mmCIF file of all heavy atoms in Angstrom:
data_model
loop_
_atom_site.group_PDB
_atom_site.id
_atom_site.type_symbol
_atom_site.label_atom_id
_atom_site.label_comp_id
_atom_site.label_asym_id
_atom_site.label_seq_id
_atom_site.Cartn_x
_atom_site.Cartn_y
_atom_site.Cartn_z
ATOM 1 N N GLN A 719 -2.540 17.789 0.460
ATOM 2 C CA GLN A 719 -3.867 18.387 0.499
ATOM 3 C C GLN A 719 -4.092 19.374 -0.642
ATOM 4 O O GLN A 719 -5.176 19.418 -1.220
ATOM 5 C CB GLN A 719 -4.080 19.100 1.835
ATOM 6 C CG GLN A 719 -4.304 18.152 3.001
ATOM 7 C CD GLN A 719 -4.308 18.857 4.341
ATOM 8 O OE1 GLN A 719 -3.714 19.924 4.498
ATOM 9 N NE2 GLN A 719 -4.977 18.260 5.320
ATOM 10 N N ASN A 720 -3.064 20.154 -0.967
ATOM 11 C CA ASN A 720 -3.157 21.152 -2.030
ATOM 12 C C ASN A 720 -2.909 20.567 -3.412
ATOM 13 O O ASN A 720 -2.960 21.286 -4.409
ATOM 14 C CB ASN A 720 -2.148 22.280 -1.793
ATOM 15 C CG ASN A 720 -2.515 23.157 -0.611
ATOM 16 O OD1 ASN A 720 -3.663 23.185 -0.172
ATOM 17 N ND2 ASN A 720 -1.532 23.881 -0.089
ATOM 18 N N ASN A 721 -2.633 19.270 -3.472
ATOM 19 C CA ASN A 721 -2.355 18.608 -4.739
ATOM 20 C C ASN A 721 -1.155 19.246 -5.435
ATOM 21 O O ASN A 721 -1.171 19.478 -6.644
ATOM 22 C CB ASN A 721 -3.579 18.655 -5.661
ATOM 23 C CG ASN A 721 -3.599 17.509 -6.662
ATOM 24 O OD1 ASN A 721 -3.103 16.418 -6.378
ATOM 25 N ND2 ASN A 721 -4.168 17.753 -7.841
ATOM 26 N N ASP A 722 -0.115 19.532 -4.658
ATOM 27 C CA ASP A 722 1.108 20.124 -5.187
ATOM 28 C C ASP A 722 1.658 19.215 -6.290
ATOM 29 O O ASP A 722 2.013 18.065 -6.035
ATOM 30 C CB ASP A 722 2.134 20.258 -4.062
ATOM 31 C CG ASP A 722 3.304 21.133 -4.444
ATOM 32 O OD1 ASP A 722 3.397 21.513 -5.628
ATOM 33 O OD2 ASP A 722 4.134 21.437 -3.559
ATOM 34 N N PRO A 723 1.749 19.720 -7.532
ATOM 35 C CA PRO A 723 2.264 18.865 -8.609
ATOM 36 C C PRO A 723 3.713 18.409 -8.480
ATOM 37 O O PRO A 723 4.103 17.419 -9.097
ATOM 38 C CB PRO A 723 2.037 19.696 -9.878
ATOM 39 C CG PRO A 723 1.092 20.791 -9.470
ATOM 40 C CD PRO A 723 1.389 21.058 -8.030
ATOM 41 N N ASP A 724 4.518 19.111 -7.688
ATOM 42 C CA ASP A 724 5.917 18.725 -7.548
ATOM 43 C C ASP A 724 6.148 17.644 -6.501
ATOM 44 O O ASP A 724 7.269 17.169 -6.338
ATOM 45 C CB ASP A 724 6.794 19.948 -7.242
ATOM 46 C CG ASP A 724 6.507 20.560 -5.882
ATOM 47 O OD1 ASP A 724 6.082 19.829 -4.965
ATOM 48 O OD2 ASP A 724 6.716 21.783 -5.729
ATOM 49 N N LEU A 725 5.092 17.256 -5.793
ATOM 50 C CA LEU A 725 5.210 16.204 -4.783
ATOM 51 C C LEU A 725 4.769 14.880 -5.402
ATOM 52 O O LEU A 725 3.584 14.549 -5.420
ATOM 53 C CB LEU A 725 4.345 16.519 -3.560
ATOM 54 C CG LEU A 725 4.416 15.468 -2.442
ATOM 55 C CD1 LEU A 725 5.829 15.408 -1.871
ATOM 56 C CD2 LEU A 725 3.409 15.805 -1.354
ATOM 57 N N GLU A 726 5.736 14.130 -5.919
ATOM 58 C CA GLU A 726 5.451 12.852 -6.552
ATOM 59 C C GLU A 726 5.753 11.685 -5.627
ATOM 60 O O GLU A 726 5.214 10.598 -5.798
ATOM 61 C CB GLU A 726 6.262 12.713 -7.839
ATOM 62 C CG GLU A 726 5.853 13.710 -8.909
ATOM 63 C CD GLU A 726 6.592 13.515 -10.217
ATOM 64 O OE1 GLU A 726 7.395 12.561 -10.317
ATOM 65 O OE2 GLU A 726 6.367 14.320 -11.148
ATOM 66 N N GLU A 727 6.611 11.916 -4.645
ATOM 67 C CA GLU A 727 6.964 10.859 -3.717
ATOM 68 C C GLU A 727 6.988 11.338 -2.281
ATOM 69 O O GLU A 727 7.644 12.332 -1.952
ATOM 70 C CB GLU A 727 8.327 10.277 -4.079
ATOM 71 C CG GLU A 727 8.345 9.582 -5.423
ATOM 72 C CD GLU A 727 9.701 8.993 -5.757
ATOM 73 O OE1 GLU A 727 10.529 8.849 -4.828
ATOM 74 O OE2 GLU A 727 9.933 8.676 -6.946
ATOM 75 N N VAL A 728 6.260 10.622 -1.429
ATOM 76 C CA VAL A 728 6.210 10.945 -0.013
ATOM 77 C C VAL A 728 6.915 9.826 0.747
ATOM 78 O O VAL A 728 6.523 8.662 0.659
ATOM 79 C CB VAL A 728 4.755 11.061 0.491
ATOM 80 C CG1 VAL A 728 4.742 11.225 2.006
ATOM 81 C CG2 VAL A 728 4.066 12.242 -0.174
ATOM 82 N N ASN A 729 7.967 10.181 1.475
ATOM 83 C CA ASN A 729 8.715 9.202 2.251
ATOM 84 C C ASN A 729 8.804 9.657 3.699
ATOM 85 O O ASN A 729 9.606 10.527 4.043
ATOM 86 C CB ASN A 729 10.124 9.024 1.678
ATOM 87 C CG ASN A 729 10.936 7.985 2.439
ATOM 88 O OD1 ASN A 729 10.570 7.584 3.544
ATOM 89 N ND2 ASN A 729 12.042 7.545 1.848
ATOM 90 N N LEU A 730 7.968 9.066 4.543
ATOM 91 C CA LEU A 730 7.949 9.400 5.959
ATOM 92 C C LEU A 730 8.606 8.278 6.755
ATOM 93 O O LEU A 730 8.454 8.189 7.971
ATOM 94 C CB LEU A 730 6.507 9.603 6.425
ATOM 95 C CG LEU A 730 5.726 10.635 5.606
ATOM 96 C CD1 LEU A 730 4.280 10.680 6.068
ATOM 97 C CD2 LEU A 730 6.379 12.002 5.759
#
Side-chain angles (χ1 to χ4, degrees):
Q719 286 171 335
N720 290 340
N721 206 31
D722 193 352
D724 67 29
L725 180 64
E726 294 184 3
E727 295 181 17
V728 173
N729 181 345
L730 305 175

